[PDB]
Amino acid sequence: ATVLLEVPFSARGDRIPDAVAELRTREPIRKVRTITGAEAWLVSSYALCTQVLEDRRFSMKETAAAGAPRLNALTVPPEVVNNMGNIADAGLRKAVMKAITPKAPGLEQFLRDTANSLLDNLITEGAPADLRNDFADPLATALHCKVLGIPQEDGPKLFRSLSIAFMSSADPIPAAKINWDRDIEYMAGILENPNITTGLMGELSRLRKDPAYSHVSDELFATIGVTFFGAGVIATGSFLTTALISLIQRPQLRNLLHEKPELIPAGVEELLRINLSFADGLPRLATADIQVGDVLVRKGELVLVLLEGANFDPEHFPNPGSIELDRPNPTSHLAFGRGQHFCPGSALGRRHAQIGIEALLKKMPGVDLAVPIDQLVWRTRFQRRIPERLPVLW
Amino acid sequence: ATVLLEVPFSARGDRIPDAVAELRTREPIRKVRTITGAEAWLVSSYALCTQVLEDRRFSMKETAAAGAPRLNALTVPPEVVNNMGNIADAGLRKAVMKAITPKAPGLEQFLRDTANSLLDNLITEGAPADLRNDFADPLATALHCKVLGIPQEDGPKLFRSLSIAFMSSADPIPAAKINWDRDIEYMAGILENPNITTGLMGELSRLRKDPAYSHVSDELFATIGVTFFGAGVIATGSFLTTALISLIQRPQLRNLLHEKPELIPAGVEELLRINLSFADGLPRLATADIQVGDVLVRKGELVLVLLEGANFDPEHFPNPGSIELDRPNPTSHLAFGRGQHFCPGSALGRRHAQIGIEALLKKMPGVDLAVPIDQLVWRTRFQRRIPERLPVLW
Numbered sequence: 001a002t003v004l005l006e007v008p009f010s011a012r013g014d015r016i017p018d019a020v021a022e023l024r025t026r027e028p029i030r031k032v033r034t035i036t037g038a039e040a041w042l043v044s045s046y047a048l049c050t051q052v053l054e055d056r057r058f059s060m061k062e063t064a065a066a067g068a069p070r071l072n073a074l075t076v077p078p079e080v081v082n083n084m085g086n087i088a089d090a091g092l093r094k095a096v097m098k099a100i101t102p103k104a105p106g107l108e109q110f111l112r113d114t115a116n117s118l119l120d121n122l123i124t125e126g127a128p129a130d131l132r133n134d135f136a137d138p139l140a141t142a143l144h145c146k147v148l149g150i151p152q153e154d155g156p157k158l159f160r161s162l163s164i165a166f167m168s169s170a171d172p173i174p175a176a177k178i179n180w181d182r183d184i185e186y187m188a189g190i191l192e193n194p195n196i197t198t199g200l201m202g203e204l205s206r207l208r209k210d211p212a213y214s215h216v217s218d219e220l221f222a223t224i225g226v227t228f229f230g231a232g233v234i235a236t237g238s239f240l241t242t243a244l245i246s247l248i249q250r251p252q253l254r255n256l257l258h259e260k261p262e263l264i265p266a267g268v269e270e271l272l273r274i275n276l277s278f279a280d281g282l283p284r285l286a287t288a289d290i291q292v293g294d295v296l297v298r299k300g301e302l303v304l305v306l307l308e309g310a311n312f313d314p315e316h317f318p319n320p321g322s323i324e325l326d327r328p329n330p331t332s333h334l335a336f337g338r339g340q341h342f343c344p345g346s347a348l349g350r351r352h353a354q355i356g357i358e359a360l361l362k363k364m365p366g367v368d369l370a371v372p373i374d375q376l377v378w379r380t381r382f383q384r385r386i387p388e389r390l391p392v393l394w
Numbered sequence: 395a396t397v398l399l400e401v402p403f404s405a406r407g408d409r410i411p412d413a414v415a416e417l418r419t420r421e422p423i424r425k426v427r428t429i430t431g432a433e434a435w436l437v438s439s440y441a442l443c444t445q446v447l448e449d450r451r452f453s454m455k456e457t458a459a460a461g462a463p464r465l466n467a468l469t470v471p472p473e474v475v476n477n478m479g480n481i482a483d484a485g486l487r488k489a490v491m492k493a494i495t496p497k498a499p500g501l502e503q504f505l506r507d508t509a510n511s512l513l514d515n516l517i518t519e520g521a522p523a524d525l526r527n528d529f530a531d532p533l534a535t536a537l538h539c540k541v542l543g544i545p546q547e548d549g550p551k552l553f554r555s556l557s558i559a560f561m562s563s564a565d566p567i568p569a570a571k572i573n574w575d576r577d578i579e580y581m582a583g584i585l586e587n588p589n590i591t592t593g594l595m596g597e598l599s600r601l602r603k604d605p606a607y608s609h610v611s612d613e614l615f616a617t618i619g620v621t622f623f624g625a626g627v628i629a630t631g632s633f634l635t636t637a638l639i640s641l642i643q644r645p646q647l648r649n650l651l652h653e654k655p656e657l658i659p660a661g662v663e664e665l666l667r668i669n670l671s672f673a674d675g676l677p678r679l680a681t682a683d684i685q686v687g688d689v690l691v692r693k694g695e696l697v698l699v700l701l702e703g704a705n706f707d708p709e710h711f712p713n714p715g716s717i718e719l720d721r722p723n724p725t726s727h728l729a730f731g732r733g734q735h736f737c738p739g740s741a742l743g744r745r746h747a748q749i750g751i752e753a754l755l756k757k758m759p760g761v762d763l764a765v766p767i768d769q770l771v772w773r774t775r776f777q778r779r780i781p782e783r784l785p786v787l788w
C-alpha cells in the first residue's frame with residue numbers, strides 16, 4: 001500500500017530529479033497529491049504543457065474559487081489572483097507593460113552600475129561572499145525600485161515581505177496578510193506622493209488623476225505596485241541566483257562567456273531553459289471537461305504545468321541537460337510560461353540576468369563555490385527553489 | 395534490496411521522528427551510514443549513551459585520526475578536535491572555566507538589558523519579527539563578545555563564519571579554512587591589544603605574559619578564543635531558537651512561565667531535555683574492542699551517541715514527550731553531554747536561555763508563530779537543527 005505521488009518532488013534547484021524523465025515517458029499527465037491534500041493532474045511533456053497553457057479553459061483566475069482543489073493557500077486576496085485580467089480590464093495593460101521594459105533611458109546603466117558596486121563591496125570585504133543575499137537579491141531589489149520609481153531605501157522593507165509572501169503553504173499565513181496590508185498602504189502613499197514622477201508608480205500616479213481612468217480604484221493602483229515588485233524581485237533574484245550556480249558548475253562555459261561576452265544572451269536563454277527556479281507546477285483549474293493526452297480532465301479539477309517537464313523534454317530539446325548556445329529553437333522554452341499569462345517582465349528578466357552575469361564574470365573571473373554543492377540549503381515550502389546562501393570564492 | 399540506514403534522520407528540530415522510539419526499542423545500538431559513506435554504530439538508549447560517554451576508550455580526540463571512519467569532514471585543524479585536552483594540558487582549564495560562568499559582575503544584567511533592547515526594537519518595528527536572526531542569535535553573539543572581553547562591534551563578522559564553520563559536510567570546506575585562519579588572526583590581534591583586559595581574552599592575554607605559562611603557544615590562546623566563541627554562540631543561539639518554538643507551541647506553558655517566572659529555570663531544564671538542536675549523534679572512535687549492549691564494537695569503529703535517543707528514553711524519563719516541571723531526575727538529561735567532554739558552558743547556556751525567555755515572555759506575552767509551523771525552513775547538513783527564520787507575531 002503506497003500513497004498517491006506527492007508534489008513537489010524536490011526543493012533542490014541545482015539538479016533535476018531522474019524521476020521527471022521517467023514520469024514524462026510513462027505518464028506525461030498523471031494524478032498527484034498537493035501539500036493541501038488535494039488531488040491534481042501533473043503535466044510534464046512539452047506537448048501537453050503547451051496545450052494546457054494555451055487553452056484558457058484551464059483558468060488561472062478560477063484557481064482562487066472558494067472550494068476548489070488547491071496547490072497551496074492563497075497569500076493574496078482572491079481577486080488579486082486575477083491581477084493581470086484586472087489591469088487589462090482597467091485599460092492599463094499598455095502602460096504597465098511599457099513601464100517594465102529594460103528600454104527606459106538610464107535603466108541598463110543603473111543596472112550595470114549597481115551590479116558593479118555590489119561586486120566591489122564583495123571584493124573589498126574578501127572571500128567568501130554570499131551571491132544570493134549580497135548580490136542577486138539586492139540587484140533584483142534595486143532594479144525594481146528604479147522600475148517602480150520608488151526610493152531605493154524603501155526596497156529592503158518591501159523585499160523582507162517576500163520570504164513569506166511567496167510561501168507555498170498548506171494553510172493561510174497570518175504574516176502574509178500583515179505584510180500585504182502594510183505594503184498596500186505603502187504603495188497607496190506612493191500614489192499620493194508628489195515627488196514620485198518616474199517609473200511604473202509615477203505613471204500610475206498620473207493615470208489615476210486622468211479623467212480617462214476616473215473609475216479605476218485606488219486599490220487596483222496600489223495592488224499593481226505590490227504585485228509587480230514582489231513578482232519581479234522574487235523571479236529575477238531567484239533566477240539569477242540559480243543561474244550563477246549552473247554557470248559556476250560549468251567552468252568551460254564560465255570561461256567562454258567571460259572570453260566572449262556577446263554570447264551572454266544566448267547563454268542566459270539556455271540558463272532560462274534549464275532553470276529549476278519554479279518550485280511547483282503552474283496551477284490551472286479546468287472550466288470544462290477537456291482531453292489532455294490520455295486523461296479526460298473534468299470541470300473543477302486542478303492541473304499543474306511542470307515547467308522543467310516541458311523544458312527538459314528530449315522530444316523538443318535534444319540533449320536536454322546540455323547547455324547548447326546554437327539550438328534552432330532557443331526561446332521556445334516555457335521559463336516565462338505561455339498563453340494568456342505569459343510573463344509580462346520577460347525582457348526585463350533577461351536583461352537583469354545578462355547584466356548581472358556580465359558584471360560578475362568581469363569582476364570575478366575566478367568565481368567558484370566556496371563550499372561543496374551539497375552544503376547549499378534549499379528553501380522549502382516556497383514558490384521558488386533557492387539556496388538560503390550561495391557562498392563563493394574567486 | 396534496501397540500503398544501510400542513513401543518518402541523520404531529519405533536520406526538523408520541532409518534533410522527534412517516531413522512528414527514534416522504534417529503533418531504541420528494537421536496536422538501541424545499530425549500524426548506520428553517515429553522509430561520508432562510512433559505517434558507524436548509532437546508540438539511542440539512555441543506558442547505552444551514558445555507557446559510551448562515560449568510557450574514555452570511546453575517544454573524541456581519535457575521531458580526527460587520518461583514515462578513520464568519519465561522521466563528517468573536519469572544519470578545524472585535526473589537533474583542534476582535542477581543544478579541551480589541549481587547554482587542560484596547558485594548565486588553563488581553571489581559568490577558561492571561570493571566565494565562562496554567568497557569575498561575572500554585570501554579566502546577567504548585560505544579558506537582560508540586551509534581550510530587552512532587542513525586543514524593544516522588534517516591538518517598535520512591528521510584527522512579524524524573526525526571533526532567530528533578530529533576537530536569539532544577536533543575544534548569543536552579544537553575550538559571547540562580553541564573555542570574551544572583545545568589542546561588541548566585532549561580533550557580527552565572527553558570527554558570519556558560523557553558518558559554514560558548523561556545517562556537517564561529506565567533504566572538506568574551503569570557506570571553513572578561509573574563515574578559520576581569518577578568525578585566528580583576529581583573536582591573535584586581540585591578545586596583542588592592550589585595551590583588552592576583561593573577559594576570557596583579557597585573562598588569556600594576562601596568562602600569556604605570565605612566566606608560569608611561557609611555553610603555551612600563541613596558537614593555543616587564539617584557538618581558545620575562536621573555539622569558545624563559535625561553540626557558545628552556535629549552541630546558545632540554536633538552543634534558545636528551538637526552545638522558543640517549543641514554548642510558543644505550548645500556550646499553557648507560555649502562560650504559566652509568564653505568570654510564575656520563578657518556574658523558568660525548571661522550564662528551561664525541561665526545554666533542554668527535549669531539545670533537538672544537535673543534528674547528529676556525538677562522535678567517538680573506539681580505541682579498544684568494547685561491548686555495548688548486544689554489539690561488540692571493534693577498535694577503530696565510529697560510534698554516534700544520539701542525545702535525543704537518551705533524552706526521550708521512557709525507561710529514564712517517563713512520558714518523555716511531556717514537559718513536566720517536577721521530575722525527580724530533571725538535570726540527568728544529556729543535553730550538555732556527559733563524561734570527559736561534558737559542556738564547559740552549561741551554566742552560561744542555562745542562563746542565556748532563562749534570561750531570554752524571561753525577557754520575551756514579559757515583552758511579548760501574546761507571542762505566537764506568524765506562519766504555520768510546517769513553513770519553517772530547517773537548515774540542512776549542519777551540526778545544529780535550526781529554522782532559517784522564526785517569524786512571530788504578538
Ligand code: HEM
Pocket residue numbers: 060084085100227228229231232233235236239282283334335336337338340341342343344345346348349350
Ligand atoms: C527570469 C525572470 C522571470 C521569470 C523566470 C519569470 C517567470 C514567470 C512565469 C512562468 C510566469 C507565468 C505564471 C503562470 O502562467 O501561472 C510569470 C508571470 C508573471 N510575472 Fe514573471 N518571471 C520573471 C521576471 C519577472 C519580472 C521582471 C516581472 C515584473 C517586473 C514579472 C512579473 C510577473 C507578473 C505580474 C506575472 C503574472 C502574469 C499573469 O498572471 O498574467 N516577472 N513570470
Ligand code: HEM
Pocket residue numbers: 454478479494621622623625626627629630633676677728729730731732734735736737738739740742743744
Ligand atoms: C544550551 C546551550 C548549550 C548546549 C545544549 C551545549 C551542548 C554541548 C554538548 C552536548 C557538548 C558535548 C559534545 C561531545 O561530548 O562530543 C558540548 C561541548 C562543548 N561546549 Fe557546549 N553547549 C551549550 C552552550 C555552550 C556555551 C555557552 C559554551 C562556551 C561559552 C560552550 C562551549 C563548549 C565547548 C568548548 C565544548 C567542547 C567540550 C570538550 O570537547 O571537552 N557550549 N556542548
